[PDB]
Amino acid sequence: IVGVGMEKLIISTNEHASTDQGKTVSRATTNSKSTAVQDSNGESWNTGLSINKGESAYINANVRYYNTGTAPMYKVTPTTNLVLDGDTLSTIKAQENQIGNNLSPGDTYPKKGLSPLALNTMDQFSSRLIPINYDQLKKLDAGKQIKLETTQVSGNFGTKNSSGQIVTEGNSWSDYISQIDSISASIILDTENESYERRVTAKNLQDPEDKTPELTIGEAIEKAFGATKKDGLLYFNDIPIDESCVELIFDDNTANKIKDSLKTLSDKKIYNVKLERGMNILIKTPTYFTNFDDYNNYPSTWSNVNTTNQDGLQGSANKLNGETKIKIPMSELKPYKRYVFSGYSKDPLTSNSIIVKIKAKEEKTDYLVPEQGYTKFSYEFETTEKDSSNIEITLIGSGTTYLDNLSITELN
C-alpha cells in the first residue's frame, strides 16, 4: 500500500524584467539673413517588465513515498494529481528522476532523515516544467493552497528461483490489484505514529465451489496483524485491541451487514461475525485507556477508585455514590483536534440517569440512562490552542451504577 505525501510547494514566477540608461550629446548652429550656436546634452533611464498570460509561473513539489502493506515494491512510479479549488491542473507520472528503487514495508523513499525529492517536470523526458495560468497565479497569491492526490502506483515484485536469483522485471503489481481487491476484505489498524493496511481473503456464500476457509472478524484480525492472545484477548505488541478496548469505524455496507448478522448470532459480539467480501473495517487504538485491572496510561489519577469486585466487563467497576474527576494537563494533546471520550456503563437495578459535563472548547452536558447491559456513550470534545485551561470532566450519577473501559481517542 503506497501513498504520496506533499511537504511543500515552490512557485517560480516567469517574468522578463530589463533596464536601460542612455546618454545623448547634440550640437547645432544657425545663420540668419546674425549667427547662432547650440549645444545639448543629457541622460535618460528606462525600466520594463513583460509577463506571459498563458504561462505565468512554474510550480515545484516535494513528496515522500510511504508503504504500509506486507510486501516491498520495486521501481515505484506513482501518479499524482494537483488541485487548486476544483480544477486539476495536471497529472504527472513519475519520471526517471523520481522513481524509488526499493520501498520496504514501513519504510519511506527517500529514507527518514533525508530531504524530500522534487517533482517539477511533466513531460516524458524531464524537459518541460509544470506551468500555471495567470488567473491561477492570482488565486495562489490570494492565500489558496494546492493539494496533492495520488491515483495509482506502478511497481514490480520479486520472484526467487530454486538457486536464489531474484528477478523483478516484467512482474508488474497491476496484474493482481483487481483480482486481490475483489475477493478480499480490507482491515486497517491505526496505532500511534504508525498505520497498517491489510487484505484478508473472504469466502463467497453464493458459490458452492468456493472452498476457501471461513473466517470471523476476530480470527481475520489476529491473522492479519499478528496479534497474540493472553486470556482470550488480542494484543498487538502490548496494546490491547479487544473489541471493547478500541474504536471500530465501518462504512455503511459493513455496518448494515454487521447489524443484520448480529441478530442471529448468539454471542452478540462483533468479533464473532463472519467475514465477507468487500468489508471495510478500521480500528483506532485509543490515546488514553484504562480497564481498572492491569492497564493505565492517563497523565492524572482517578479521583475515586473502588475496584474490589468482580464486575464491569472484566473484574473492574470503579463506581460508588460519589462522582469521579480527571485533570487534563493539556501537555500531551493536539492543539487543533477533535477527541472522543468513551466508556461502558451498566445499571443492574433501575435508578436515575447519569449526567456528564465536559469543558474543552465548549461546555456540553448530556444525560444517559444506563441499562442492564454495558453501553458505549462516546461523547466528543476538542482542543483549542495547546495553551488553554485544563480539561475537566464529570460523570454525575447515583444509584450504585457501574463503569468500565473508559478511553479517549482522536479522529481524523
User: Which residue positions form the known binding site for Ca(2+)?
Assistant: 291, 293, 314, 316, 404
Give the one entry of Ca ion, a second copy, none that residue 52 binds, where binding means its C-beta sits below a cut-off of 5 to 8 angstroms depending on kind. Answer: a second copy
Radius of gyration of the chain (CA): 33
Query: Under the criterion CB under 8 A, does residue 24 sit at the interface with a second copy?
Result: yes
Query: Under the criterion CB under 8 A, does residue 117 sit at the interface with a second copy?
Result: yes
Distance CA(331)–CA(335), nearest Å, equals 10
Binding mask 244-283 for Ca ion (x = CB under 5 A): ----------------------------------------
Please, what is the minimum distance in Å from the beta carbon of residue 147 to a second copy?
Answer: 8
Please, what is the minimum distance in Å from the beta carbon of residue 335 to a second copy?
Answer: 22
CA distances from 397 to 240, 353, 370, 389 (A): 29, 6, 10, 25
Distance CA(94)–CA(122), nearest Å, equals 8
Query: Under the criterion CB under 8 A, does residue 48 sit at the interface with a second copy?
Result: yes
Query: Under the criterion CB under 8 A, does residue 306 sit at the interface with a second copy?
Result: no
User: Cβ distance 404 to 309 under 8 Å?
Assistant: no
Interface pick for a second copy out of 29, 163, 266, 310 (rule CB under 8 A): 29
Query: Under the criterion CB under 5 A, does residue 61 sit at the interface with Ca ion?
Result: no
Angle at 340 between CA 397 and CA 219, to 5 degrees: 105
Query: Under the criterion CB under 8 A, does residue 27 sit at the interface with a second copy?
Result: yes
Interface pick for a second copy out of 4, 59, 92, 189 (rule CB under 8 A): 92
Grid cell listed for 291: 480497564
Return the amino acid letter for 284: K
Angle at 170 between CA 169 and CA 172, to 5 degrees: 110
N-term to C-term CA, the chain: 19
Give the one entry of Ca ion, a second copy, none that residue 229 binds, where binding means its C-beta sits below a cut-off of 5 to 8 angstroms depending on kind. Answer: none
Query: Under the criterion CB under 8 A, does residue 369 sit at the interface with a second copy?
Result: no
Pairing outcome for strands 184-191 and 280-284: parallel
Q: Where in 279-338 is the site for Ca ion (CB under 5 A)?
A: 291, 312-314, 316
Grid cell listed for 241: 485491541
Interface pick for a second copy out of 154, 195, 261, 352 (rule CB under 8 A): 154
Residues sharing a CB contact under 8 Å with residue 111, sequence separation 6 or more, in sequence order: none
Residues facing 80 on adjacent strands: 92, 150
Q: Where in 209-248 is the site for Ca ion (CB under 5 A)?
A: none
Grid cell listed for 140: 495562489
Interface pick for a second copy out of 161, 163, 178, 412 (rule CB under 8 A): 178
Nearest C-alpha neighbor of 323 from the set 289, 357, 373, 374: 357
- Residue 169 or 260: the one with the smaller Cβ distance to a second copy is 169
Q: Where in 311-350 is the site for a second copy (CB under 8 A)?
A: none
Query: Under the criterion CB under 8 A, does residue 205 sit at the interface with a second copy?
Result: no
Residue 105 has a CB neighbour count (10 Å cut-off) of 14
Binding window for a second copy (CB under 8 A); candidates: 166-174, 243-251, 284-292, 362-370: 166-174
Give the one entry of a second copy, Ca ion, none that residue 39 binds, where binding means its C-beta sits below a cut-off of 5 to 8 angstroms depending on kind. Answer: a second copy
Which residue's entry shows cell 473508559? 406
Give the one entry of Ca ion, a second copy, none that residue 318 binds, where binding means its C-beta sits below a cut-off of 5 to 8 angstroms depending on kind. Answer: none
- Residue 81 or 351: the one with the smaller Cβ distance to a second copy is 81
How far is C-alpha 206 from the geometric centre of its chain's CA atoms? 36
Residues facing 47 on adjacent strands: 19
Query: Under the criterion CB under 8 A, does residue 23 sit at the interface with a second copy?
Result: yes
Binding mask 52-71 for a second copy (x = CB under 8 A): xxx--xx---x---------
What is the arrangement of strands in the sheet containing 194-201, beginning at the earlier edge strand? 194-201, 184-191, 280-284, 247-250
Q: Where in 179-198 is the site for a second copy (CB under 8 A)?
A: 179, 181-182
**Where do contacts with Ca ion occur on this chain (CB under 5 A)?**
291, 312-314, 316, 404
